[PDB]
Amino acid sequence: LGAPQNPNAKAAGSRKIHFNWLPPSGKPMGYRVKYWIQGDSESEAHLLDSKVPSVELTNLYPYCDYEMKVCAYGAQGEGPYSSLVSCRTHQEVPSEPGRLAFNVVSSTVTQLSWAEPAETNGEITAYEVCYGLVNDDNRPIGPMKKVLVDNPKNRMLLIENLRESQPYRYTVKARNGAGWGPEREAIINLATQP
């Protein structure tokens, strides 16, 4: 019942990683792989029955640390578990930002406020706000006015000098190392608003 030395594991996609290791010597009919999130229990891990010295893990959380280990069972049974490997999955496009909440100041001035994306998938580096004129059918009138937020820390944005009683479209997107993400959009007319 030899132990499988020299394993190396890397990422293969944004939601899957690849575990390989050099075979031992003895009587392994099939393999078993223990794998869990770095910071989680040892016994509470996911186990995946393999017959070949290689696996492709799935439903892994992007930008999350993983630990794993593989044993070998056969004509005698399970042997020793290999050296513990540690792999972190790739980043991914963040989700839509939080609810678009306004704070009405004047008929031409507002205070835009959103929450950080539901699932970050990495570290959000920046956001983007775009606003502009619109009709009743969500069909913009003219170009959007995209304003790159400076740092991801601030979710507050002030907006002044606007047409009164005119509906506006606002959009917010999230950028993380993997790139941009789906947007959150709100149509708001400061007249109807409190």
Partner 1 sequence: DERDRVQKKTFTKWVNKHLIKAQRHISDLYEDLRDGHNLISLLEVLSGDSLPREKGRMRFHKLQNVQIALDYLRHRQVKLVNIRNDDIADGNPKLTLGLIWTIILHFQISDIQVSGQSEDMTAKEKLLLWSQRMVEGYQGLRCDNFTSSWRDGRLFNAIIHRHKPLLIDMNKVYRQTNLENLDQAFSVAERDLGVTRLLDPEDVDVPQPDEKSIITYVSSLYDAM
Q: Does 148 bind partner 1 (CB under 8 A)?
A: no
Of 20-28, 63-71, 117-125, 138-146: span binding partner 1 (CB under 8 A)? 117-125
Return the sign of the alpha-carbon dihedral for residues 20, 23, 24, 29: positive
Tell me how far apart the terminal alpha carbons of the chain are, to the nearest angstrom: 74
- Cα separation of 117 and 7, whole Å? 36
Q: How far is the CB of 16 from partner 1 (least distance, A)?
A: 20
Q: Does 115 bind partner 1 (CB under 8 A)?
A: yes
Residue nearer to partner 1 on the CB measure, 4 or 62? 62
Question: Contacts with partner 1: how many residues (CB under 8 A)?
Answer: 17
Residue nearer to partner 1 on the CB measure, 107 or 111? 111
The helix (H) or strand (E) run that includes residue 147 is: strand 145-148
Contacts 24+ apart (CB under 8 A), 133-142: 133/163, 133/166, 133/167, 133/168, 133/169, 134/167, 134/168, 134/169, 134/187, 135/167, 136/167, 138/169, 138/187, 140/169
Q: How far is the CB of 117 from partner 1 (least distance, A)?
A: 7
Q: Does 106 bind partner 1 (CB under 8 A)?
A: no
Q: Does 187 bind partner 1 (CB under 8 A)?
A: no
Of 18-26, 49-57, 109-117, 174-182: span binding partner 1 (CB under 8 A)? 109-117
Q: Among residue numbers 17 through 46, which ones bind partner 1 (CB under 8 A)?
A: none
Of 13-21, 114-122, 129-137, 160-168: span binding partner 1 (CB under 8 A)? 114-122
| Tokens matching residue 179 | 């790139």
Q: Does 147 bind partner 1 (CB under 8 A)?
A: no
Q: How far is the CB of 116 from partner 1 (least distance, A)?
A: 5
Q: Among residue numbers 151 through 170, which ones bind partner 1 (CB under 8 A)?
A: 154-158
Give the footprint of partner 1 on this chain (CB under 8 A). Answer: 98-99, 101, 103, 111, 113-119, 154-158
